[model samples]
Every structure is written in structure tokens, then in C-alpha cells.
Target chain A: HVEVVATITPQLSIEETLIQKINHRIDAIDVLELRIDQFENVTVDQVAEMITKLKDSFKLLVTYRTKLQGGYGQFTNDSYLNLISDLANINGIDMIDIEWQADIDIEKHQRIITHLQQYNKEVIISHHNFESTPPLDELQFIFFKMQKFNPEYVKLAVMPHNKNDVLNLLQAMSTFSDTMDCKVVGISMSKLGLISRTAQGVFGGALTYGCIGEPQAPGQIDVTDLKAQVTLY
Target chain B: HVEVVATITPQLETLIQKINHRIDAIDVLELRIDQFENVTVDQVAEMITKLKDSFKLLVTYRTKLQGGYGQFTNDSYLNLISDLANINGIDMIDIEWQADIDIEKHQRIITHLQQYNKEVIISHHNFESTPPLDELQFIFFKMQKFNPEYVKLAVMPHNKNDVLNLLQAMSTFSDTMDCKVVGISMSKLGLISRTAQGVFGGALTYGCIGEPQAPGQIDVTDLKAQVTLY
Candidate 1:
């Protein structure tokens, strides 16, 4: 079954009232990914506090985005690893989103995963290309390398300038779902690619991201509208 | 690559002028006669007369079964088509597969159209949901039995999965069939198939301008870019 992962960007501050508002509409969301990179003056302590309160209702996937990878986060390798390590064990934080290039040394990435797995925290290794979608072969090359790491999920998000690009992604997704039993999270961003998420909403995927009240990513749709279209397929 | 079939629903003298302006953008033009409110054969000829020398005309008297103008009887439908057959410049005629139920009337209509050298497009539509690909393929085999120049199927897609089958069918038909095949999925979710005609193996796409004649009709300008792309 496909699940809705509501994204909460740390860009704006949320109070106890906002958390209560989200909990009331919790029926619409299955998982919540805290986009810590988008947070305004965010800190490790506040994220730990936020997770403690919100984790009981939603399966949490916390992300600290880096500036290089289209994120507002300025955390260096050591700083990011340190912060997430502290919050990885919080009650609500069941997952941690790590970038493909989070560390120059492969051991550092393996080390982070090793640390989280001790407490049963899942790892989602992700890559984002805001430019345009690469050809199928190039995507596959990237896929094999990511799969070597053997994370719980592999997420790839690309921009689709033309309609055929979406076809390219669909063919790839169907290929993996049939041949490999591993979970694949793929997204084509922007208005031209709104159907990617909407399409995935109908076709079964591991998950598709949604917004609590505001959007965190370009292709993210509101939870209400997401539920309306996902049931079609 | 897919071509655009621009539709003009019972236009006046301005219709010819409209076709003239967008002639280069359109591969063919569809005239929905059922949309005409009580017209005479003379008016139909006059309109055909204006565009005959210049454009490829497709005569369609759409029925109520397919979100068309109204319910039409076998005789009433055949009579209108018989009239359209006499009119010159009509490159094609869209016939609903339902018409085959009246084989005697169907034969008369087909014979008349063949006499005038009018290409046939046997069409089927599903306004509710996209059926299984096997069912669609079966529908095509039945449509081909009618020996049409082209076969068209328009299904409503529920999601990406629904859209996939329609594309798969079009590609399968496009590769094997000697005749042309056009597959369209009606909802907004299926619009992806419209732009990927080259990939889907579709013959052409339907488009509109200011006021859309049907849902999921892309603007001609947007469709123009889509057809031009790979």
C-alpha cells in the first residue's frame, strides 16, 4: 500500500498549537518527514523536542538538507552527523534521511547507518537533480551504486522538462518493482511533472510526499488533494 | 510523430477563415455536425465548399453514447452520413462501433462512403474507467473487422497504471496493424500520453483553442510544441 509522508519544513517555527493542528488531521498522513534544512534558525535541541511530541502520531523521517543539494542547511559533515545522531533515538524519529554525498568517506556513511540501525532506525539514501532527468542508463548506473549501500529505501527526484521524461521514469520504476523486491521512491518535480506524484499516488509506490499545510518541495501536493486522486488507480 | 486534428463545431463563414489562420498547425479538421442546430444540406455544402480546396475535413455526427450531441437512430445516422458522402473534400468519417449492431444499415453507410472514397475511423469511448488492456485489444480486433482506415479508442484513466495500458495498446496496435490507431485517455492524468505520441505510437492528437470542445484538449500551441518534441 502507498503511504502519504507529510513534510514539515523547519523553515518556519512551529508551536504546540501547530503540532496539535497537525495531530487533528493525522488521519490524512501516514509518515512525517521533518525538513530541518528549511528551518529558520533551527537547532538540534528543538528538533529533538519537536520529534518527542510529533513522533507518537506519525512515523518520522527527519532530514537536514545541505546547501549543495538544494537545501538551506549549512551543516558540515561532522556537524550534521553529530546533530542527527543525538536526535535519531528520540521517540518519534524512526527514520533519518541521509544524502548520497553526506560524507566524502564511505565509512562515515556506513558508520551513520551502523549507529542508527542499532536502535532499529531506517535509512533512506536520497539524490536530487533539480536540473533535468538523466537518461535511463545513467539513472540505472546511479541505482546500482545506491543499492550497494542496501538502505531500507532509495529515493531519486528529478526535474522533467518534457512528457517523455516522465515515461522514462515510469518504465524504470516498473522495471525495478518487478525484478527487484526493494522499495523505490521516485519523484518528478514541478507543475510540468505534477502528474508524477499524482500518478504515483494511484500506482503503488513506497510513499509520496505531501505538505502539512504548506509545500516543502516543488512537486509536493496538499494532503487533501493527494487523497482525492490517489484512489483512482 | 503525432499530428493535430483541430475541431470546428458548426462554424459560420468565420470557420473557413479560422482554418486558414491555423492551417499549418493542423493535419486535419473535425466538423461536429451534431453540434449544428437544425442545419440544411445546403449549409453543409457551403461550409465544405469554402474549405474543400484547402483543408482535410473529417465529418463526425457524434452520438449520446459517447458524450456527443444526441441520440441518433440507425436510419437517421446513416442518412446524415449518406449526405456527407456526397460532399467533396471530406477525407474521413468517424463511425461509432455501436452502428455495427445494424448491419444492414451499416453496410449501406459503408458502401456509400466507399463510393465517395471517404476514409473510415471506427471509434469507441469509455467515459468512466480505463478497462483492461486485453479488453481494449479485443475492441480493436472487432473495429478492424469493419475495415476502417483508422481505429480510435478513448478511455478514462484512473491513474498512471491506467494510462500505461492505453499506451501499451497503442504501441502494440501501431506496430502490428496495417491501418492507423489513435488511443486517448480522457482525464487530466492521461494528458501525459498526448505529448508522448511518438513513444505511444499514436497517429495524431486532438486539440482546441479558446473554448475547449472536450475535456483534456490541449491548446493547439501547446500541442504544436509537443508534436515537435521527441
Candidate 2:
């Protein structure tokens, strides 16, 4: 079954009302993606508190995104690394998204993975290209390189200029999923690539993202509509 | 906008009733005259005259060899299509590209239709299995040789890979071809093709009104919902 990941990016302060609002619509989601990077002036304690409440309904996948990856946060490299490490230790946080870098040191990545595993948290190693989709062989190379870190799932999201570009992304994703043992979450952004969200399941993608309130990515469907379409396929 | 063709295969009265109720909801009215038993050219011509006011008419004579019930001789088929093109109501006609007839006959009909300013849809269907990517691409290129306004290919898929192959062909051909194209991967497994193909540059999608004319076709109501959702 393909899991539906609903993203919640709290632009305001984390309060009981927001948590209550999220729990009310929990039935539409399988995984709640807390885009912590989108949170403004929020501290670790409040994030942990929000996770504790939301985790009761859905598995939490926390992301502290940097601006380079199309995120709101402008964290320096050291701050981004330290914040992710801190998030890994938080209770009720079931998963953490570690952005894949081609030049990322193997020893440091393993240490982060080792720490995440110690807390019984799953890891999703992800890469995104808001500009354009890479060539097929390059996509495979990046995905396989991520697998070397021993993450539970590997993800790729890219912009497609045309229908054929979307096919390139789907072909790479489906081929990788069939040949590799790892779970794949692939997305092609924009209205031109909207079908990829619904079609990823048919192509062996294990998870697809939806929105709880606002779409975190381009072409993100509402959680209610996303669930209906997912069940259809 | 993607054109939604609601295929009508019933007799005249039944066809009129479907049109009366569904005219506003559809982009084109495809009269599947092949399914009408003992139907004559005069009957089709008169039917078009009455139904021509609001709809874009697409006349399709699906012959038996291509999984349709219509039986026709080469002479009768050519005569029927050539005659239909002269009628004022028809905006387009669908010609089977893979039919057993010689290519010269197909081109002749296409030329005659063009002379009357009617668009042509060059179509090929495979119900058993999808052809390889290379062959499917070749078929699209071959259909383009006729210079029709549209080219359509529908094939069956046994697995997800087959579905992908069909979409891959569609995505590639739709981009490279000058004319608009319609591609469908038939059966339950290929249902997404109907919903998603429009975004891949498909010009038309066929939806059944009262009944499906082909496998994997959805009702017009549900098809409209799915298309807008995508």
C-alpha cells in the first residue's frame, strides 16, 4: 500500500489549537510531515511538544529544510546539522528526513544514521531539484548512492518542462523500485506533472505527499482528495 | 482544454435521447454507426442534419476485425466514409489505420475528407497486448504519414510495466508529432491512462454515456470528475 504523507508547516506559533486542528483531520493522513523549517521563531521544546500530540494519530516525519532545497529556513550548515541531530533525539518523532548531498562525507552521514537508529527512528534520505529533472543514469546513481547510507526510503522530486520529462522521472523511479529493495517516494512538481502524484503508486512508489492546510510543494493535492485518488489506484 | 468525446452507439432515438441529456457536458459526440444494425447512409445523413446544431460530430465505423461489431466490405466501407464526409455536420471522422485495407485506400479517403475540410483521426487498437516501445513509436510515425488532425492508439496492458510502456510511448509521440494524439492503455490496470493522458498532450478522451464502447472506458460523469481532479 502507498502511504499518504500530509505536510503541516506551522507559520504561526505552535499552540494547542493548531494541534487540535491537525488531530481533527488525522484520518485523511498516514504520515504527518512537520516542516519544522517553515516554523517561525519556534524552539525545540515546542516542536517536541507538538510532535508528542500529533504522533498519537500519525507517524511523524520531521524536516528542517534549508533554503537551497526550496525551504523557508535560512539555516547555516552547522545550525542545520545540529538542529537535525537534536530532532533525532526528540521523543515521538518517528522519522527524520536527511537531505542527500553528492559530496556528503560517508563517515559523518553514518554517524547521523547511527544516532537516528539508536532512537528507534526511521530515516528517509531525500533529494530535490526544483529546476529540472536530471538524466536517467544520473538519477539512478544518486538513488543508489543514498542507499549506501542504509535509509528506510529514498526520495526524488524534480521539475519537468514537458510530458517526456515527467516520463523520465517515472521511468527512473519505477525502474529503481523494481530493481532495488528500498522503498521509493518520487514526485514531479507543477501542474504539468500533477499525474505523477497519483501515478507514483502504479509505478511502485511507496509513499506520496498531500497537504493538510497548504501545499508544501507544487502540485500537492489536498489530503482528502489525495486519499481518495490513492485508494482508487 | 482536453476534449471529452462521449461515444454513442445506440439507434437514432436512443442516440438523440443521450445527446439531449449529455450535449452540454461533452466536447464531441462520436456516433458509432457500426453498432447500428442495417443502418443506411441516408439515415446517417439525416441523423447528422438533425443533431448538427450544437455538437462537434465525429463519425466512427468500427469494423469487426478491430474488435468492433461493424462488418463492411472494402467497397462499402470506402463508399460510406466518402459519403459521410460530404455531410455538413461532421467535423471529423475516425479511420482505422491498421485495418486490412491497402494504404492507398486509406490515403484516398483521408484526401477526400481533407477536400471537404473535415478532420481525420487515424486510429489503431490492440486488445491482446501492448507492442514494444519501438513498435508503438513506429505505429505513431506511420499514422502521421496520413496527415490526419489526430492519431489514436489503444492497447492492453498485463502489468504495470506495460502501462508505463504505453505512457512512455504516448509522452514521446505526443511531443514529437505535429498533430494532436490520443493514447489509451485499455483494461482496469490502464485506467490511469484515461485520467492522466490529457496532461501528456492527448487531445481527446472517450467516455461512455450509457455503456462503454471499449474496455477500461469509464462513465462520462466519473470521467469528468477524474479528469478535473488530475
Candidate 3:
């Protein structure tokens, strides 16, 4: 099935209200992304509580951006990873994001993943290239690098300058999906890359992120528009 | 001494021809690369020979993929670094980001440079959006992980606000002129970002090799034209 994921980019109060609203409209979504940056006052308990309330409504994904990859204003890498680790242990959070840049210390990253796996939490190891899209072969190299972690999902987000960039990502997704047991989410972030969300679904991407309001990344379409475009097999 | 830089693609024959031709050019430019994929055999020998005649010619290093990031094929990384080491004329090689994950690879990279007494410019480029000041500081810290000869940073400016932030980063982080901070404001809104280097105390501004290789890069001639007037 083609999964439509939306980022919950709202303040704590708004998040509470939005989660309730989204639950009422739960049938519209397959996944929910709780951007840790959105809530300035959030604690693991708060996130855990929210996840418990919404897990049945949609697949819960918790993402905390580090300083390197452009997260919120504060928090060190160790702290951010710890937050994700704590949130992963909460039983309600289904998935957590661990970026390749964060994988600089493979041992530390593996420890977190191991701890999270102990609780059976899904891991989405991700890499983001906000500036420009890379060639296909290079993207495949990056994918293989991330695959060393053996996570449940591998996500790659790159900004596309042209149709060829988008095509390269789709090709990578198709190639990886054919052999790997894990899910592949290869997206082109920016206007030129939006079509890839639907096209990649046809090519076998496990999921594509959309925006509930403001996009977490560029070129993200609204859920309704995204659903209309992708036909799940 | 005036520096003449060339931007050479990874094409073997083309790189060799360009290196040989530059040896004869009156201006004697250095090579300011926007990217490098895989260096072919004989290409490095040709460059080394040219460097012998024009010791001022330098290679501005870059990776094969876009955004100046991405792992190259096997021994490709080692070969490029080795070229930087063995070549006498290659004065400085650019290193983007830190080698936190690939410490061994980075050590090999640095060891090659040290063996040849070549200067390393640890550099970073953000082509999409400009990061905030704190984030810039964080990036600088990451760059410090390698303990390079010099540290540099570049970011794409979306507006005057973004340019101001980049300038701020340069001022705050650059302790000495030798630190070499580069501020890049890409697209039309940020064209003036290059020239503003004079005001911001930027050590140098980057220009293209032949074509406009990276976004927001002015041709070397145009950069000279603009800088000459000031």
C-alpha cells in the first residue's frame, strides 16, 4: 500500500488540537510525522502520551533534527539522539529518524537502534540533501552506506534541479526495493521533485511525506492532492 | 603573486589537455574545482608536469556529486588525495565538512597532504537555504573535528537577511584572515553577496572553471572584473 505521511508542525496546544482533529479524520492518512522541532515545550512523556493516543489512528513517526541537518534552534547531537531513544522506548512511537550525518559514530548510532529495537520500534535511517540532487550511482552509494545499519526503512531526501534528478531518485528506489527487504523512501524535495512522490509510488516507494499545513521539506503536497495522484496496488 | 585557477572536470583527456594548455597561458591561473569524480591515469602526471613550470597553479578540490558531498568509487578518494600529495604544484586542496564518520579516510587524506606540505582548506557549502547563526557555529565545530590547516564556510543566501547572517558567521568564527571564510549568496537576490566579501572580511571568493559549474558562481573573468574595480 502507498503510505501518505504528514508532518505535525504545530505548537504543543495546536498539536493536541490537531491530533484530535486528525484522529477524527484518521481515515485520510496512513502515517503521521511528529516533528520534534514543532513543539518547544515537549517532553518524552508528552510525546509518549500523544503517541499512545494517536498510534491506532496512524503510524507514528518521531523525528528530531540535529544541528547538523538543520533541526530546531537548540539541543546538542547527543541530547537529540537521547530524546529519540527515550521516545522510542515509549511503546507508542512506531518509528524514529536517525540521519546518516548522525551516523558518524556508528557505535553510538547502533546502540540507539539496538535499544529502540529492544522495544520493537521501527527505525528510519535517513539522509537529506537540501541543496542539489546527486547522480544515480552516487545516490546508490549513499543508500548502501546507510544500509549498513540494517534499519526497517531507508529514507533519502534531495532537492531536484531538473526532471533527471527526480528520475535518478526513482531509479535508486526501484533498484533498492527489488533486492532489499526494508522499505525505501526516496523523495525529491522542491517543486521540480514533487511528481516523484506519485511516480515513486508506482516504482515501489514504501511511503511519501506530505504536509498537513506547512511542508517539513519543500515540494511536499497536501495529503488530499497526494492521495489523488498515487494509486496503491 | 597573482593566482590563476582552473576548474577542471574529471574527464581524463580534457583535464590533461587543460593542464598542459594552462602551462602556456600568460595569466597562469590555478584550478578552482566545483567537483571531481574519478581522476584518470596520466591526468595527474600531466598536472604535475604543468605544476613544475607554474608552481602557483592550485587545485580547488571538490567531490564528484552535487552539493559537494557523496562518496566516490573505490580508491577514487585515495587517488585524488594521493594526487594532491604527490603533485608539487597543487598548493591547497579543499575539504568540505568533517571526517567524523570516516576518521581513517580523513587521516589518510590529511596524511597525504602533510607528506607534500600542502595546505588544506576545510570548507562547507550550503546550496539550498542559509542556516541560522547557531547552526553555523555547530557546523564550524564539526569542521574543527579534522584539525585542518584552515577552515571555511559557504551558504546560499535567499535574501539580504540571509546575507547578513552569513557575514555574521564569518565575523564571529574567523579569528584571523588566514582562516579563510567564503560567503556565497546564490541566485539573483544574493549576487551582491560575493562582492560584499570585502566588507565582511572574507579571505577569497570562488569563481567557475569554464562553465557555471555550481549555482551562483560567477565566471572567473567576471569576478576579476568586479574585484578589480573595488
Candidate 4:
């Protein structure tokens, strides 16, 4: 019941080159994440064209990730909101990731979330800490805060400093999923936290991220290796 | 921190030939002596001599009561173990927790094996549903008292909760105890333990080279690939 995601950051806006790169390794992944924030000088029409080209082959997720959460984009709050609102209106987009951090009003985030759902697009509300994992209580607080938006899934990614930190992340995930009706994805990043990636299903995680090309985040596994372990459950 | 063991059931006439064919794929070979049609000290010794050159040997002489094929009296089992201790090139040996032998006698065999530089694996098997967490830990602690090199626990699980119980026990003991632990939750419901057990601090995973020796025993080739990904 878990989906393996392959992420693409289109450095070259050419649709033919991007399609060729994706087609070679598309068999290993279930969904494709178009990291719109990582795109260089690409327009909304170009992304929509790329989506229309590849949507039949795989479910597509559009992520306008922010620089605060390990992403490349730096936009004003209005620019960020406008870009996501436009991406949500695209016909072929099946899912959109909205970060909880981005210096925007929570009310605006809720409106866009409702708008995305109204268009029948799934929403993933995600938060990430690149430095260190927060304490369990703080993690729970942040998790519930994101749940206020009524998204389909909530994702938490943190950097672990010790083995106990990895355990803490898993514990938080399992506890949340056991108590609430919401779907959750918890990840502890880096080689030290690789165990969390392989064993998240033993706890209650909805999905894990894998990369087909160069890894976009630290501790991201290859799509082939991720699929092999995930499908064993 | 984990080792994959390939088990051999000696019921076939071509047992030694099978071991030879699989030597390249195996790092540790578990010779299930109970599966031999007629158990003998000399036959086992000859077989070990033939294959010990190629693989690290783990000798398991299970009894019929503990889901094995052979029937051995307490005296014969003790003598068999004493004889196995003297056999050369045996890297490790398995001693069943519920074997019908005296506590001190069991300790003597363990001590004897260690004296000959062979590590001991103290193991228990439950073909029914897994016990509660406290009971699982109790069994672990009782086995740990022997101070053997490894403590192996295998249990059957009827559902996913049982699998979680087995994993939690494995993680708790392996994190606190000095002795290595090998934990397995048997059957299809517990198959997750085979691939993800290493992440919970388990030390050894069992898989068969030819035919499976236990429930939920995956093929060695497939098991190795899955476990190594962790």
C-alpha cells in the first residue's frame, strides 16, 4: 500500500530530454515528483506540458518546495502562493506538496488546500528540519498544526544525531498513526538514519521518497533499492 | 552485525554433493543432523570433514519434540553433543532450550563447546502463537543466563501484532544484552521479520539453500538481497 516516489528537478526545460531521462528509469517508481522549485527559468506552461506528456505513464506530484525546507526556490509569500495556486489548476496534476514553513498565512494555505482538493488533487502537507530532529512533543505539536489544513497526508523529515533520535522519529510516527485518522510519513535523514527508510512500514508510514537520478535530499535511496525492501512488507 | 546461514537437511543421498554445489553461496552452513535417516557420530564426522574445508559449520541436532525428525534419549543426546564438541572444524553449535537434559549437564556441554573454540547458539522454538512481551523477555533472560555466544528465538504469529511483539522483544534485548540475539517470527504473517529483523538488532538470519527447514524460511539468495538492503 506504499508508493515509491521518483523526483525530477528539470535543470534543462526541454521536454524531450526530460522525458528521455525519466523513461529510462520509470519502471522502478510508482509516482513522479516534479520539483517545480528546483526548475531553472521554467514557466508554468512548460511544467504543464511535461506533466501532460508523462501523466499516462505515472501519477504525477507537483512540489513547489521552499528553501527553508531543503529546497532551491526563494520566492516572496505572494509569489509562492500564486505559483502553487497555478500548479493546482493544471489538469494532469494528481498531487501537490505544500510546505508548512514558507512565511505565509495559515489561512491562505488552507484556502489553497481546499482549492486543490476541489479540483480532485491529493495534498501532502510536509515539514522538514535539515539540522536536527525536534523533541517528540514538539514534533507532535507541529504534526497536529499541519493537520489543521485537512490535507490527505502529512510528511515529517528530520536529521537524526543518534540512534535514539531515529527511534524517536519512528515512535512519533507510530503513535500518531495509532491515535489519529490521518496518514503520516516520518523520515530520519542521513546514512545513520537509513534504517528508518527500510523499516518505516513496521511502524505506520504512508510513503517514502526515492530518487531515480541524483538524490535530491540526503539519505535518499535509489528507487530500485527502495522498491525491493518496501515491497517485502 | 548480521550473518546469513544456509541450512542443510541431510535426508538426501547427495547431501555432501549439495553442500559442495552451494559452498560458493554460503558463508555459514547449518548441518541439520536430525534430518539424517540414521544418526551416527562417524557419519556426521565424515560429512563435516568433507565440507568443513569450504564453509563455516553450525551443527544443529534437533529432536522430534522440537519440530525435528530425530528421536534421541537424554543420554544419547548428551553423548551426541559431547562427541560433536570433540569434532574438528565446527565453528558453532545449537543447544535447544527445551531439550530433556539436566541444567548442569547442559552447562557442561556449553562449557565443553567453548573450550574447543566453538560458539554456542542457545535456541527455542514455538510453533504456535507468540507469547506476550514479558514472557518473551523472560525466555530471553533465561537463555541469556547460559552466556552463550548467541540466543535464538523463533515463534509463530497469527497476525501483525505478533510480529511487532517479536520485533520489540528482539530490539529491547539486543540493545541491552551483550550476547548476540537471533529473532524470527515464523509463517507468512511474520515474514516481515526476515527482511526487517536486522534493523531491530538481530544478529543472524536463517534461510535454506535447497529446501526450507522451518516455516517462513526464505531462500538464501532472496533473503540475502533483502536483508542487505537494510
lDDT per residue as tens, model 1, B23-80: 7778778877777765555677777766664446887878877878745665677677
Candidate 1, CAPRI quality class derived from DockQ: incorrect
In model 4 chain A, which range of ten residues has the least summed lDDT? A10-19
Q: What do the candidate models score in CA lDDT, each in turn?
A: 0.72, 0.81, 0.64, 0.79
| DockQ winner between candidates 3 and 4 | 4
Report residue B102 deviation for candidate 1 (angstroms).
21
Choose the strongest candidate by DockQ: 2
Q: Is candidate 3 or candidate 4 better by TM-score?
A: 4
Best by lDDT: 2
Q: Where does candidate 2 stray beyond 4 Å?
A: A11-13, A39-44, B12-19, B49-52, B213-215
lDDT of 1 at A130: 88
- lDDT tens per residue, model 3, B1-230: 12323454452266455445434332334453434344442475575464354434456555544265335643565466566666666667765554344767776787678668877767776667888878877777666656676567767765444655665566556643444455555664455445434434455665554577555566655555544422
RMSD of 1: 9.4
Question: How does chain B score by TM in each prediction?
Answer: 0.89, 0.92, 0.72, 0.91
lDDT string, candidate 1, A133-186, tens digits: 989787766666666677787787888866556656665665555556567777
Per-residue lDDT of candidate 3, residues A145-218 (tens digit):
78878898999988877545765776687788877888899887765565456545655688877776556667
Q: How far is A165's C-alpha from truth in model 2 (Å)?
A: 1.6
Model 4: lDDT of residue A163: 53
Interface RMSD of the candidates, in order: 6.1, 1.5, 18.9, 3.5
Candidate structures ordered by lDDT, highest first: 2, 4, 1, 3
Error of 3 at B21 (Å): 65
